[PDB]
Design a protein around this nucleic acid. Structure first.
Lengths: 212, 168, 77, 184, 134, 45, 81
RNA sequence: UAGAAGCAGCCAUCCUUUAAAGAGUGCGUAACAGCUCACCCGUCGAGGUCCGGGGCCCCGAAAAUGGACGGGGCUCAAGC
RNA sequence: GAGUCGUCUCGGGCGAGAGCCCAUAUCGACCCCGAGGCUUGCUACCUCGCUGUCGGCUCUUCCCAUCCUGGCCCUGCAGC
C-alpha cells in the first residue's frame, strides 16, 4: 500500500504470466473466493489487489509490445469488486475452471435472479410433512411416492429479471439446489494480443455437437 | 463539607505549614500513582490548568477515581500509567454556625471565627499539570475521554485543554 | 495597470500568545494593505493595531497566490 | 464557506420547459400547466442566459449557497412536475377495522378509523387529484411540494400517540414518495 | 442463540437421560438406544464435558450420523503435551508449551479438517489455539 | 405489521436529554445540547 | 451590476464630478477607477462612492492604461464629459 | 459457567492466507444462529476529510402592584 | 425591611453504578457549577419624640419552578 511499491509488485507479476484476467471477486464469499484463491495457487496462478492500481495494465503494456491496457483496448472490462487473476491456464480452461469450482450459491430471498432457475424432477429423499405443502405453494407440483416427497416434473420456477420471493428461495435452499454463481464471474481475459470476453469463453462443447 | 465557594479562588492566603499550627486535618487521598512504571511508554498527555484555583482534597479523590476507574476497566492495569501529581497542602478554615434559632445565635461574628480545619487543598495556577497520564498511540482515545471527565470537577475551568506534550 | 496580491507576513500578540498570520490582499500600494490588515485582524481577533506586528509585506504576482481561497478569487481580476 | 467571485451556479433547462423571469419571481411552464414561486432572499437575482437559467449573487457566504441550491432544486422539481407530474402512492393499513377511504369533494374523508363514529378530513390542494383504488390510494398532481403536503395532511389526521405505538398502527402511511421510505 | 435443534451437548462418556435425549431425540430410524451406543464409545474420557455435536435426522429413514464438535485441536494438544485439563488462566499460567516438532504433527492430520495451506500455515493455525487458556 | 407504519412510528431514535423524536441516523440532537442520542421507542423484538 | 468597461460617473471622489471607468475590479469590496487626465481623472480606489453605471459600455482590456482605455472611451465619445 | 459458542464478566489479544478479516461495532438468544460493521475493489468523476486556537452570536437562563437600554424606538443601525 | 445567601428551595453539568440484557424508561453515589430569596443564620444600613406582635378572620392583587383542567413528548406506553 505504497504507490509504485504496490503497482510495481503487480507490475512484475503481469509480465510474469501469459494470461491475465479480471474477475469479479465481489459476488462471493470468502468461502468461495478464499478457497478459490488457494485453488488458483495449486493451479498455477495467483489473484491480486489494487485500487486505481488495478487499471495500470497500462504500465505493463507500455513496458511491452501489446494491446491489453486501457489505451489500445476496447473498454476496460473492470467492474466493482473485481480482482486480477494471473495464470499459466489457458483462458477457456480458466473460465471452465472458475465455473466448476465454487461451492455453491443459493438464490437469496428478494433478489433479482440472474438467469432462469429450474428444478429437476425426482425424489427429494425427504419424508412426508409440511414440506409438500410448501412445494405446492411455490409453484412446484409434488406428491408422495415411495414414501418420500417427489417433484412431479422439471419446471422453470422463476424467469430471469424476476425477483425471487422469500418462500421460493428457502425451499430451493432446503432442496440443496443452487442455480446462482458465487464462484468468480469472469469480466474478461487477455492472452497474447487478444481479449476474450465471457460470452466467447463460455463454450458448451456438447451444445455445438447437439446444434449440428 | 460545605459546597466549594472558597475553593475556586487564590486571592485567599496561605495557612499551610501543618507543623506550625495546632490542629491539622487528615487526608482522603491515599493513592496517587497507579498502573505500570512510567518508563514503559513514550507519549504524554496532560490536562493543563488555565485558571487559578484551589482544588479540594475531596475533588482530587473523586475526579481521579472516576477517571481511573474508566481506564482500569477498559484498558486494564497492564497498560497506561496515570499520575495526579499534586498533594493538597493549603488548610481550610470555618466559622462555626448551625441551626439553633430563637434566642440563640449560631452565629457569631467573632469570639474565635478562626478556623477549625475542614480540609486541605492544592493550589493550581496557569499552565500546571493537573493530570499526566502516559500512554501509547493505541491507547490515545481513552486518555482524552478520561481528561474531559476530569475538567468538569475542576473548580473553575480549563482553556488550555487536553494537551499533547508530545512526550519530549 | 498594477494590481498585485500582497503577501503580508506577521504576528500578533493576544493574551501573551503568538498568532501567525499570512494575509494576502490585493491593492496597488502597501498603504492599502496596511490599513486593510490592521482593520481585518483588529475587528475579528478583537485586538488593537498597536499589538499587531508586521514582519513583512511582499508583493507576489496576481496570477498566483499561496492560498487556494485567494488564488481562486484573484483569477477573475 | 466555499469561496468563488461569481458566485454562480447554473440550471439546465430542457426544450420541454421554458422559464420566464421577472426580477426575483419565477414562472415555469411546460406542456402541462404552470407553477409560480417567489424566490426570496437578499441579493440573489435569477435571470435567463440563453437556454440556461443562472442563479447568482456577487458575494459568497455560507447562508447564501444553501438557499441558492434550494432554488435550483425547486426548479428541478418543476421540470419533472410540469412535464408529466409527480405520483406518491400511499397505503391505508388497519389493525382491526375495515376502514373506508373515499374522496368526497375537495376533501378526502377517512371513516371508521378505530371504530370512530366521527369523520376525519384533511385538505386537498387546487393542483392535486386524489384517486383511491381498493386500499391503495395514489396522490397525483403537477407539483411535488403540493403533493407532498396533501399526502402528509392525510397522515397527520390519522395521527395516534394517545395509546401505545406498537399495538395500534391504524392509519394511512407513505409507502412511496418517489423512492420507497424506509427501513427501520 | 443457540437453537435447541439437532445440535445439543452431552457430557463425556454417558448416555440416556430422558430429558436431553428423549426430547432432542437421536433417531436411527429406531429410537435412541443406537445413538446411546455410539455417543459414549467415541467420547470415552474419565470425566464429562459439554461436547458440541450435531445429528442429522429428518423424520424419514430417520438414520443418524453425527459429528464430534470436539476432537478438533483442543484435545489434540492434550495427548502431545500430556496434560488433560486446560489452564484455568491464559498467559498468566502456561501449564505447558509444546515443542515445535509436536506442533507439526498436530497440523499434518488436521489438514483435511482445516483449510491449512502449506505445513507452516497449519501450525500457525494450531499455535494460535495453543496460547489461549482461560 | 412492520414496514411502512413502523418506520415513521417505530424506527427513529429519541433524545436522551429532551425526549425529542429525531431521525433514525442523525449524529447530533435538534435542540437540546450535542448529545449522542439513543435508539428507539422499541418493545417489539 | 458593475462589470469592466462599463462607463461610470460618481458624485464623490476627487473633484467631484466626475465621469470615470472601471478598469479593474480590485476585490469584491473595492474597484479601481481611472480615466483620462483630460477630464482631470487620475487613478484611485473606490468602494462605492455612489458609483452608478451609465448606459454606455465600451471594450477595454482586463488591466489596462489610458491610451487603450483612452482609445475606446474616445470612439464612444465621452472624453469630453 | 447451565451456556458465555465475537456479543455477563476476566485475561491473553496471538498466528496463517489476502478484495478484505477486529480472538470483533450494535442489534439479536440469557448463551450455536440470523441482520450488520469497520474493510475493500468499485461506479458517479471532485477539491477533499481531520483535528486545534480565536472573535462574535445561540442554549444553559424561572419570580412575585409596571415590564422597561433614561425613554422612544433602532437590525448593511441609532448596534458591536 | 434592605444587604448577604453558610442554610433553605430549585435548577444544570459529569456520570461511578442498578434497571432482565441495556448509564441516561426509571433510579443515581463522588464531585463540580448556577438561579431565587420562600426557612434559618450573618449584618447593623434604616427606625428606639411608639413604621403596633403572631395566629385567625375578612377583603383584594400578583408570581410560576403547575396540583387539576386544556394541548403535548418519552416510557420497562397492552388496556384501564
Amino acid at each position: 500500500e505504497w504507490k509504485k511499491k504496490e503497482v510495481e509488485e503487480l507490475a512484475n507479476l503481469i509480465k510474469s504470466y501469459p494470461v491475465v484476467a479480471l474477475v469479479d471477486v465481489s459476488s462471493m464469499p470468502a468461502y468461495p473466493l478464499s478457497q478459490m484463491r488457494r485453488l488458483i495457487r495449486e493451479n498455477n496462478g495467483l489473484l491480486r489487489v489494487s485500487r486505481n492500481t488495478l487499471i495500470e495494465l497500462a504500465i505493463k503494456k507500455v513496458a511491452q509490445e501489446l494491446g491489453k491496457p486501457e489505451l489500445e483496448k476496447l473498454i476496460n472490462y473492470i467492474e466493482g469488486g473485481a480482482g486480477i487473476l494471473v495464470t499459466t491456464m489457458n483462458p477457456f480452461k480458466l473460465y471452465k475452471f472458475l465455473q466448476q469450482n465454487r461451492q455453491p450459491a443459493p438464490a437469496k430471498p428478494g433478489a433479482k435472479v440472474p438467469k432462469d432457475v429450474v428444478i429437476p424432477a425426482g425424489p427429494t429423499s425427504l419424508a412426508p410433512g409440511p414440506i409438500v405443502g410448501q412445494m405446492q405453494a411455490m409453484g412446484i407440483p409434488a406428491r408422495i411416492e415411495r414414501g418420500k416427497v417427489t417433484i412431479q416434473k422439471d419446471t422453470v420456477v422463476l424467469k430471469a429479471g424476476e425477483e425471487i420471493t422469500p418462500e421460493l428461495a428457502n425451499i430451493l435452499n432446503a432442496l440443496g439446489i443452487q442455480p446462482l454463481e458465487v464462484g468468480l464471474d469472469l469480466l474478461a481475459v487477455y492472452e497474447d494480443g487478444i481479449i476474450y470476453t465471457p460470452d466467447v469463453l463460455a463454450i458448451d462443447e456438447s451444445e455445438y455437437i447437439n446444434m449440428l | 463539607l460545605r459546597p466549594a465557594k472558597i475553593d475556586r479562588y487564590v486571592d485567599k492566603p496561605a495557612y499551610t505549614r501543618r507543623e506550625y499550627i495546632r490542629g491539622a486535618p487528615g487526608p482522603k487521598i491515599t493513592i496517587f500513582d497507579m498502573g505500570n512504571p512510567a518508563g514503559d511508554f513514550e507519549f504524554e498527555v496532560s490536562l493543563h490548568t488555565a485558571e487559578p484555583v484551589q482544588i479540594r482534597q475531596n475533588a482530587l479523590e473523586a475526579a481521579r477515581q472516576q477517571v481511573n476507574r474508566y481506564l482500569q476497566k477498559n484498558v486494564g492495569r497492564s497498560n497506561y500509567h496515570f499520575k495526579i501529581r499534586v498533594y493538597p497542602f493549603q488548610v481550610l478554615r470555618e466559622n462555626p454556625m448551625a441551626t439553633g434559632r430563637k434566642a440563640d445565635r449560631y452565629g457569631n461574628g467573632m469570639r474565635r471565627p478562626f478556623g477549625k480545619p475542614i480540609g486541605l487543598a492544592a493550589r493550581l495556577k496557569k499552565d500546571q499539570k493537573i493530570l499526566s497520564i502516559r500512554v501509547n498511540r493505541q491507547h490515545l482515545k481513552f486518555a482524552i475521554e478520561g481528561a474531559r471527565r476530569a475538567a468538569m470537577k475542576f473548580p473553575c475551568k480549563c482553556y488550555y485543554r487536553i494537551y499533547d506534550k508530545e512526550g519530549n | 495597470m498594477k494590481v498585485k496580491v500582497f503577501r503580508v507576513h506577521g504576528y500578533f500578540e493576544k493574551n501573551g500568545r503568538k498568532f501567525k498570520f499570512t494575509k494576502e490582499y490585493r491593492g496597488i500600494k502597501e498603504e492599502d494593505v496596511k490599513e486593510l490588515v490592521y482593520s481585518d485582524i483588529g475587528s475579528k481577533h478583537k485586538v488593537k493595531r498597536n499589538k499587531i506586528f508586521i514582519k513583512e509585506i511582499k508583493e507576489i504576482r496576481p496570477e498566483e497566490a499561496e492560498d487556494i481561497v485567494v488564488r481562486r478569487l484573484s483569477l477573475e481580476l | 464557506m466555499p469561496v468563488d467571485a461569481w458566485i454562480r451556479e447554473e440550471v439546465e433547462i430542457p426544450e420541454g420547459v421554458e422559464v420566464t423571469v421577472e426580477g426575483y419571481k419565477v414562472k415555469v411552464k411546460g406542456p402541462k400547466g404552470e407553477l409560480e414561486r417567489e424566490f426570496f432572499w437578499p441579493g440573489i437575482q435569477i435571470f435567463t442566459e440563453d437556454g440556461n437559467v443562472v442563479i447568482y449573487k456577487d458575494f459568497p457566504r455560507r447562508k447564501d449557497v444553501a438557499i441558492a441550491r434550494t432554488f435550483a432544486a425547486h426548479i428541478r422539481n418543476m421540470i419533472k412536475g410540469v412535464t408529466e407530474g409527480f405520483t406518491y402512492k400511499l397505503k391505508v393499513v388497519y389493525s382491526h377495522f375495515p376502514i373506508s377511504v373515499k374522496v368526497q369533494g375537495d376533501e378526502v374523508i377517512i371513516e371508521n378509523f378505530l371504530g370512530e363514529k366521527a369523520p376525519r378530513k384533511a385538505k386537498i390542494l387546487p393542483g392535486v387529484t386524489v384517486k383511491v383504488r381498493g386500499q391503495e390510494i395514489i396522490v397525483e398532481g403537477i407539483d411535488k411540494e403540493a403533493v407532498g403536503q396533501t399526502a402528509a395532511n392525510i397522515e397527520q389526521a390519522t395521527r395516534i400517540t394517545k395509546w401505545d405505538r406498537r399495538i395500534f398502527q391504524d392509519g394511512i402511511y407513505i409507502v412511496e414518495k418517489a423512492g420507497k421510505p424506509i427501513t427501520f | 442463540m443457540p437453537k435447541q435443534v439437532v445440535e445439543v451437548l452431552v457430557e463425556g462418556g454417558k448416555a440416556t437421560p430422558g430429558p436431553p435425549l428423549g426430547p432432542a431425540i437421536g433417531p436411527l430410524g429406531l429410537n435412541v438406544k443406537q445413538v446411546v451406543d455410539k455417543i459414549n464409545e467415541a467420547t470415552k474420557d474419565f470425566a464429562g464435558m459439554q461436547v458440541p455435536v450435531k445429528i442429522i435426522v429428518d423424520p424419514v429413514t430417520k438414520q443418524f450420523e453425527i459429528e464430534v464438535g470436539v476432537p478438533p485441536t483442543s484435545q489434540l494438544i492434550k495427548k502431545e503435551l500430556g496434560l488433560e485439563k486446560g489452564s484455568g488462566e491464559p498467559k498468566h499460567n502456561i501449564v505447558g508449551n509444546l515443542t515445535m516438532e509436536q506442533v507439526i504433527k498436530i497440523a499434518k492430520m488436521k489438514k483435511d479438517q482445516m483449510l491449512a495451506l502449506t505445513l507452516k500455515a497449519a501450525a500457525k493455525e494450531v499455535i494460535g489455539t495453543a496460547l489461549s487458556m482461560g | 405489521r412492520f414496514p411502512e407504519a413502523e418506520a415513521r412510528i417505530f424506527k427513529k431514535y429519541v433524545c436522551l436529554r429532551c425526549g425529542a423524536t429525531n431521525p433514525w441516523g442523525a449524529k447530533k440532537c435538534r435542540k437540546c445540547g450535542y448529545k449522542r442520542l439513543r435508539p428507539k421507542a422499541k418493545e417489539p423484538r | 451590476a458593475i462589470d469592466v468597461g462599463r462607463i461610470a460617473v460618481v458624485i464623490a471622489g476627487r473633484r467631484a464630478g466626475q465621469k470615470v471607468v472601471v478598469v479593474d475590479i480590485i476585490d469584491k469590496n473595492f474597484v479601481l477607477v481611472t480615466g483620462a487626465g483630460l477630464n482631470k481623472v487620475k487613478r484611485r480606489r473606490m468602494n462605492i462612492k455612489h458609483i452608478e453605471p451609465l448606459p454606455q459600455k465600451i471594450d477595454i482590456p482586463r488591466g489596462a492604461s489610458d491610451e487603450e482605455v483612452r482609445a475606446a472611451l474616445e470612439k464612444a465619445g465621452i472624453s469630453l464629459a
